[PDB]
Structure formats: structure tokens, C-alpha cells
Amino acid sequence: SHMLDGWVPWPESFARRYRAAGYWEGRPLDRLLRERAAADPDRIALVDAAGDRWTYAELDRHADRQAAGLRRLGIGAGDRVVVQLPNTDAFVVLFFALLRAGAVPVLTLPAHRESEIVHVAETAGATAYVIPDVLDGFDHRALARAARKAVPSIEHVLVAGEAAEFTALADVDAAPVPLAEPDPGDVALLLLSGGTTGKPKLIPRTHDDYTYNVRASAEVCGFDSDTVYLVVLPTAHNFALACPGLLGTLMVGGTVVLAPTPSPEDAFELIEREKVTATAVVPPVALLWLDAVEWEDADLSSLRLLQVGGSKLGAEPAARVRPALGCTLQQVFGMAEGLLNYTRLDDPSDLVIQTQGRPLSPDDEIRVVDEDGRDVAPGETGELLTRGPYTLRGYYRAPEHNARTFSDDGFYRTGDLVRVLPSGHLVVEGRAKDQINRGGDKISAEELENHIMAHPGVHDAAVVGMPDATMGERTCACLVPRAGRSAPAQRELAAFLTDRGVAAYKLPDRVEVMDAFPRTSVGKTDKKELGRRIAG
Ligand SMILES: Nc1ncnc2c1ncn2[C@@H]1O[C@H](COP(=O)(O)O)[C@@H](O)[C@H]1O
Ligand SMILES: O=C(O)c1ccccc1O
Numbered sequence: 282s283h284m285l286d287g288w289v290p291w292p293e294s295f296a297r298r299y300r301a302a303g304y305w306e307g308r309p310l311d312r313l314l315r316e317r318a319a320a321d322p323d324r325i326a327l328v329d330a331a332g333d334r335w336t337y338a339e340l341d342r343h344a345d346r347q348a349a350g351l352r353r354l355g356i357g358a359g360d361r362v363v364v365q366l367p368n369t370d371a372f373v374v375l376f377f378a379l380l381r382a383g384a385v386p387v388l389t390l391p392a393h394r395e396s397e398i399v400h401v402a403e404t405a406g407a408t409a410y411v412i413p414d415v416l417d418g419f420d421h422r423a424l425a426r427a428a429r430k431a432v433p434s435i436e437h438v439l440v441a442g443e444a445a446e447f448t449a450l451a452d453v454d455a456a457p458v459p460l461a462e463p464d465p466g467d468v469a470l471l472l473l474s475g476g477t478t479g480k481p482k483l484i485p486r487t488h489d490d491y492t493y494n495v496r497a498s499a500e501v502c503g504f505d506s507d508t509v510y511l512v513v514l515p516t517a518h519n520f521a522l523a524c525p526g527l528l529g530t531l532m533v534g535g536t537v538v539l540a541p542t543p544s545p546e547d548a549f550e551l552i553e554r555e556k557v558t559a560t561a562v563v564p565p566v567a568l569l570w571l572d573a574v575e576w577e578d579a580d581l582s583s584l585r586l587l588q589v590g591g592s593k594l595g596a597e598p599a600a601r602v603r604p605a606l607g608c609t610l611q612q613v614f615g616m617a618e619g620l621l622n623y624t625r626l627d628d629p630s631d632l633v634i635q636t637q638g639r640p641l642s643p644d645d646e647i648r649v650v651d652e653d654g655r656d657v658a659p660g661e662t663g664e665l666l667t668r669g670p671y672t673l674r675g676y677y678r679a680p681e682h683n684a685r686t687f688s689d690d691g692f693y694r695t696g697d698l699v700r701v702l703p704s705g706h707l708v709v710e711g712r713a714k715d716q717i718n719r720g721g722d723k724i725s726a727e728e729l730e731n732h733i734m735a736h737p738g739v740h741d742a743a744v745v746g747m748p749d750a751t752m753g754e755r756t757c758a759c760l761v762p763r764a765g766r767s768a769p770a771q772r773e774l775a776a777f778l779t780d781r782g783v784a785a786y787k788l789p790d791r792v793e794v795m796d797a798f799p800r801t802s803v804g805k806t807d808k809k810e811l812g813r814r815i816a817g
Contacts (some may be wrong), residue, residue: 284359285385285468288485289675289683292691296466299670302644304497305489309462310469311380313492313532314341321534324506328555329370330541337534340374342457347378349455354409354437354448358383358461361405361471363398363428363435364517365389365412365421368539371441371450372516373527375411378453380469381460384409387471387483388517391416395427395782396732397473400480402432404678405471410435411450414442422447427782465489471677472519472617475723477696477714479731483677484617490671491523494621497641499529501623502586502611504559508535509583511551511560513543519617520561520590545570549579556583561613563591563721568598568751571605584608586626590615590637591721592753593709599634612637614709618693619672620645622707636706637699645669648692649701662710665699666692715808717746717754722786724756726808729787733758736777738768743798744789745811757815758789761797768794791815 283290291299299305314337317326322338335343356362362384366372379386387405389398391413402410410428412421422445425438438447463469465488476482486494502525504510510530514521516539522528527537538555540548543566551557562570567589574581587602590613602610614622614637622638640647649663650656657663668691675683686694696714699707717724726744733742741761746754762768769777775788799810 283467284383284463285485287678288468289673290466291674295670299489299493299644302670304493304642304644304670305465306492306496307465307489308492309380309465310488310491310528311344311377313495313528314344314377317531317534321506324534325536326531327370327373328536328538330368330539330547330551332554333370335370337531340377343374344377344381345457346454347374348381348460349458350453351378351382351384352458352460353455354453356382356384356409356437358463360384360409361387361407362409362411363387363389363402363405363407365391365393365398365410366441366516367391367413367416368512368516368541369441370539373537375450376516380463383460383463385468385470387473388522389473390515390517390784392784392786393473394779394784395424395431397481397782397784398424398428399431399782401471401473401483402428402435404480404483406434407432408434409437409439411439412441414440414445424782463488465492468677474617474676475716476682476725477716477727478682478725479727481725481728482679482682484673485677486671486673490619493642494619494671495523495525495528495532498523498525498621498623499533501625501641502529502559502588503626504529504533504535506534507558508533509538509555509558510535511538511540511548511555511557513540513548513560513562513566520588520613520615524561524588524590524613524615524621526561543569545573545577545579549573549577549581552584553580558583559586559588560584561588561590564589564594564598564753565720565751567594567602571598571601574605582607586611588613592718593637596634600630603630609633614638614707616695618695620647620667620669620693620695624706632704632706635708636702637709638707639705640667640669642669642671645672646692647701649699660700660702662698662700664713665695665697665707667695668692717744717756719754719756719786720752724787729756729758729783729789732778732781732783733760733774733789735781736769736774738763738766740764741798743806743808743811745808745815747791747812747815755790756787757791757793759793759795759798759811759815762794768792
């Protein structure tokens with residue numbers, strides 16, 4: 282019996298093995314804060330960008346008070362709550378408050394707009410939505426009004442800021458009350474993945490598997506009480522939340538420092554001010570920092586570990602991390618779906634430079650298969666399939682996609698092309714899935730194509746990635762105009778998509794108009810050949 286329907290538990294035989302091996306320790310996710318605050322109440326747990334500071338005991342207490350306030354609003358056992366918050370202390374307190382109230386956080390990113398927010402709120406049956414007031418020039422309260430009109434289940438809107446007609450998140454506060462613990466085998470939170478289909482996909486992560494994700498990651502990355510971790514990616518990004526991220530920092534009793542942006546202006550100042558020892562970035566930010574040290578005078582000497590993931594960091598900039606930034610590079614090839622690959626901190630520099638790591642868990646199982654589904658010869662390139670103690674067995678409430686995406690024996694088809702080396706380290710070679718990786722941001726081609734085809738000048742759309750030296754990939758929208766109509770150019774299409782509620786990282790970089798798309802002999806649109814026609 283599980284508190285949530287719509288997800289796919291592990292087979293009992295696997296669950297027994299993972300419990301027996303010590304992976305699944307049977308503790309709710311919120312206990313990592315409860316346990317740390319009991320052992321080290323007066324250690325500094327959290328610093329925000331302004332320099333305000335909270336101890337473990339203060340964070341634990343505030344989470345209890347906000348959990349009690351949430352229950353007063355009717356937000357509790359099993360309710361899904363969409364969270365869209367910046368890198369501020371509000372998110373950290375609310376994350377644990379929701380867990381302790383029994384609610385299931387549905388984590389979205391500040392960039393997400395009406396299309397993504399409405400879909401995930403509709404899918405999850407969310408009863409509440411948590412937003413800032415204004416962030417990076419955008420009034421999320423307007424977006425909350427749109428989401429409520431489209432999703433009747435949303436009863437409460439909690440605002441980190443000026444609440445307007447809604448509820449101020451700060452007022453969600455009450456005297457702590459005894460709350461029952463959740464079953465550790467139940468879903469603790471839902472993550473978002475760009476995915477490959479027409480709608481974003483939600484990833485259920487259980488208390489046991491996410492705690493293991495956090496704990497094992499902290500071990501591999503040498504996180505402990507003298508770690509000062511800078512949250513540069515969004516707090517809701519799996520990489521910065523749990524790999525080991527802020528949760529791993531709190532679990533071991535280090536200090537979490539929240540960066541408001543990844544710019545050197547903000548990040549370098551915080552690294553010097555707070556003596557940051559570890560952080561995690563995507564390659565475009567790594568390149569920016571590697572450049573910026575040549576004209577910034579910040580003292581970054583405290584930095585010991587720079588994790589780089591989300592897309593493949595090239596060997597040439599990888600080699601520059603130690604000379605330029607004075608720290609150890611760790612390549613991380615991970616996914617919200619589960620499987621994490623890490624270079625080890627004392628790997629030879631050759632493997633840190635040239636590979637994307639090896640799996641976190643001894644019981645991470647990996648297969649590399651050809652087009653016919655057969656295992657490749659050792660060292661050959663094929664598609665990575667994986668199964669393990671923190672990799673999902675299905676997306677949330679997506680049975681049709683699950684039937685296509687997981688093999689019969691439960692292997693998740695990642696859509697990544699990889700080689701496995703004799704040491705077990707992986708090299709990322711490309712992608713099989715129809716999803717563009719734009720500076721770390723994942724763009725489902727099918728979803729974007731459906732949005733674009735809603736434009737009155739478009740009959741058909743095919744979204745193709747184009748290589749980019751610093752972004753990895755950019756997005757080209759190939760358009761067949763509607764009969765007797767002119768297709769839009771890039772700027773009009775961008776405006777149409779933004780008004781439609783499409784996140785800004787999905788706006789096509791380039792538009793190419795054409796009377797027809799190349800097709801295979803099936804005949805699906807041949808995006809291999811579209812890439813060539815784009816290039817001439
Ligand atoms: N170090 C890395 N190198 C290459 N690709 C990566 C890396 N880290 C993450 N990814 C990509 O990000 C995907 C996971 O993100 P998502 O599908 O949004 O959960 C992987 O399947 C890869 O395509
Ligand atoms: O989703 C990702 O891109 C990712 C990258 C590195 C580590 C964990 C992750 O979820």
C-alpha cells in the first residue's frame with residue numbers, strides 16, 4: 282500500500298536486495314535534517330546571498346513551524362504541491378516543511394511558464410502552488426492566476442514575497458504539532474524531466490532511494506562537515522539538490538550557501554566571502570568562470586571541488602580547471618531519472634579530463650545496446666540502459682510512455698550514446714533521443730514542435746539541434762508554412778511561444794522554412810538529414 286497512485290514500485294526481490302545492502306535505510310527524507318540538527322544544532326546550516334545565516338536547530342525548528350502552518354491550510358498527507366522558487370532560504374525551509382506535513386513537492390524551475398506549470402499541476406492533481414512575487418522581471422503571481430484558471434485542484438497559492446490576494450509564505454507558520462512519519466518506500470517528491478514526448482514527464486523519487494542518492498553521492502564527493510557548498514544551479518535542479526547538492530551538505534553537517542545567479546560577480550564574491558569549498562555547474566558556466574578568473578580579482582583559493590555536468594565538458598576546458606580555478610574537477614553524468622556517474626576525486630587526471638565518470642552504486646546495472654537492442658562489443662558505442670537502487674521503474678502517471686521507455690525487465694532507456702572503458706568509466710558519445718541539450722537545458726523536440734505548429738502560419742514543424750562550441754547545442758525550428766500563409770521569423774515565433782507560456786530556454790535559436798521534410802522509409806521525419814539540409 283502506497284500513499285500515491287500513478288507510479289511503479291520496484292519488484293520486491295530488488296527492494297529486498299537494496300535494503301539488505303544498506304542502500305535503503307528506511308528513513309524519511311526529512312530525517313537527514315532532524316538527525317543533523319540533533320547532533321550539531323548550532324552549526325551554520327544555511328547562508329543566503331545577503332549574508333543572513335541559520336543554524337541547523339533554527340532550520341529544523343522553522344521547518345516544523347511551517348509544516349504546522351501548512352496543515353492549518355489543509356496541505357498535508359499525500360497532497361502534491363508545485364514549488365517554483367529562487368535560490369533563497371524560503372525554498373530550503375519549505376522543502377522540509379512540505380515533507381514533514383506529508384505533502385509531496387513537485388519541483389519546477391524559475392524559468393518554467395504556463396505550459397509547463399499547468400501540465401505538471403494538472404498531472405499531479407496539485408492542490409497548491411508556491412511562487413515568488415516577481416523574479417527576473419517576471420510576475421509569477423500572474424502565472425499563478427493562469428494556473429488556477431486551468432487547474433481547478435489548486436486551492437492555495439503561497440507567495441515568497443508580496444502575496445497580493447494569495448497567502449504569504451512567511452505567514453505559513455504555527456506552533457509545531459506531532460506529525461506522523463511517512464513510509465520510506467513511498468514517493469517523497471516529484472522531479473521534472475524535459476523528456477522526449479509532447480508533455481514534460483514527472484519522476485517519482487522515494488524517501489529510501491533519494492536518501493541513498495544523497496548519502497552515497499556525499500561519500501563519493503568527500504562531503505562532510507567542513508564542506509561549504511555553493512548552490513549555483515536552481516535549488517530544484519537534481520544536480521544541486523541531491524548529487525550531493527544541498528541535501529548532501531545538510532546531511533553531513535556542512536554549510537549551504539545560496540547563489541542568486543551563476544555570474545562571476547555573484548558567485549566569485551560568495552566563494553571568497555564564505556570560503557566555498559565545493560560547487561556544481563553546467564559546462565557553459567564552467568567556461569565562463571574559466572575565462573573570468575583572468576580579469577576578476579576574487580580569491581577563489583578555498584574552492585576544492587568543481588562538479589561539471591548536465592552536458593559533456595570537453596577535454597580541453599577540463600584540463601584547464603586545475604590551473605585556472607585551483608581545484609579538482611569532477612565530471613558528473615547524471616539524470617533526474619536516477620543513474621549518476623562520477624569521476625572519483627583521486628582518479629588520474631587522464632580520466633577526469635577524458636571521461637564522464639563511473640556509476641555511483643555497486644548495484645547500478647548498465648547495458649550498452651545497438652539499434653537491434655543487442656549488447657555491443659566491449660568499447661563500442663551504443664545506447665545506455667540502466668537499472669538500480671535509485672533509478673525509476675516508471676514515470677508518474679505516464680503508462681504509455683513507460684511502455685516505450687523501460688524494457689520488460691525494468692531497464693530505463695536513457696537515450697544517451699556512450700562507450701564503457703576497461704576501468705568502467707563512461708565516455709558520452711552522443712544521443713539517440715529526440716531531445717536537444719541546450720547548455721544543460723533539455724528540450725523535448727516533440728513538445729516544442731506541437732507548440733510551434735499551433736502558430737497560424739505553420740503547418741508542420743521539425744526541431745533539430747545544431748552543434749555549438751559553448752552551448753553544446755542550439756535549437757533550429759524547421760517550418761513548413763501553412764497553405765497559402767507566410768511562416769513566422771525567429772522573433773515573432775519567440776513572442777508567440779512566450780505568450781503561449783513556453784519556457785525561454787525552449788525558444789528556437791534559428792528558423793528555417795522549407796516546403797517539406799525529409800523522411801525515412803517508414804516514414805518518420807529524418808532529422809539526421811534535416812541537420813545536413815540546415816548546413817547546406
Ligand atoms: N556530464 C554529462 N555529459 C553528458 N550529458 C549529460 C551529463 N550530465 C547530464 N547529461 C544529460 O542529461 C540527461 C539527464 O537529464 P534529464 O533527462 O533532464 O533528467 C542525461 O540523460 C544526459 O543526456
Ligand atoms: O539532470 C541532470 O542534467 C543532472 C546532471 C548531473 C547530475 C544530476 C543530474 O540530474
